[PDB]
Amino acid sequence: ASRLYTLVLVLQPQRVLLGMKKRGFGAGRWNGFGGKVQEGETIEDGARRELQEESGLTVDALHKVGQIVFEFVGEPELMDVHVFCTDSIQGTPVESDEMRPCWFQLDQIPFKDMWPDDSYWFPLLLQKKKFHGYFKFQGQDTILDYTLREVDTV
Ligand SMILES: Nc1nc2ccccc2nc1N1CCCC1
Numbered sequence: 001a002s003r004l005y006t007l008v009l010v011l012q013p014q015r016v017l018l019g020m021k022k023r024g025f026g027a028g029r030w031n032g033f034g035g036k037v038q039e040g041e042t043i044e045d046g047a048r049r050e051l052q053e054e055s056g057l058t059v060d061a062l063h064k065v066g067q068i069v070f071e072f073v074g075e076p077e078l079m080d081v082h083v084f085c086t087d088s089i090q091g092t093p094v095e096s097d098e099m100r101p102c103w104f105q106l107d108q109i110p111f112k113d114m115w116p117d118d119s120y121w122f123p124l125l126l127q128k129k130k131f132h133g134y135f136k137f138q139g140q141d142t143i144l145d146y147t148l149r150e151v152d153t154v
Contacts, residue, residue: 002078006035006037007068007083008062008084009032011125017104020100020101030113056094065125066130067080068135070117116142117135117146120133120148134148
């Protein structure tokens with residue numbers, strides 16, 4: 001009863017890359033890069049493809065850092081989001097009709113213009129912790145309840 005999704009954060013020692021969606025899913029918020037996984041495609045392969053297609057970057061090594069399940073009250077399908085980190089990229093991010101990438105110093109993460117769950121798990125990602133999480137939403141701006149715990153293996 002869930003659909004697989006990937007989310008990739010390009011995290012360097014002093015900055016992180018986010019992209020502003022110009023429309024569709026996530027318009028007007030800063031997002032990591034990702035999307036649905038294809039049939040016959042592993043999750044790690046889906047994440048590499050999604051990062052490259054949406055940001056224009058080429059990634060060597062991806063590290064699995066978390067798994068987050070999203071429930072939207074009333075919607076049957078859960079979103080099972082597999083979160084990845086990387087610091088080994090080649091290229092320059094590309095702005096397209098769909099996405100506007102920007103680098104953010106770690107102290108200037110725009111949490112007020114991101115999703116409400118990001119304020120909870122993003123700090124774990126930034127200090128190299130792995131996590132498993134669950135968030136129940138009503139709409140897109142209200143967390144009804146949640147769980148989030150640090151783990152040794154994702
Ligand atoms: N992190 C996200 N939180 C959301 C909360 C409510 C509604 C939608 C959301 N989308 C998110 N992300 C976009 C790509 C994966 C994570």
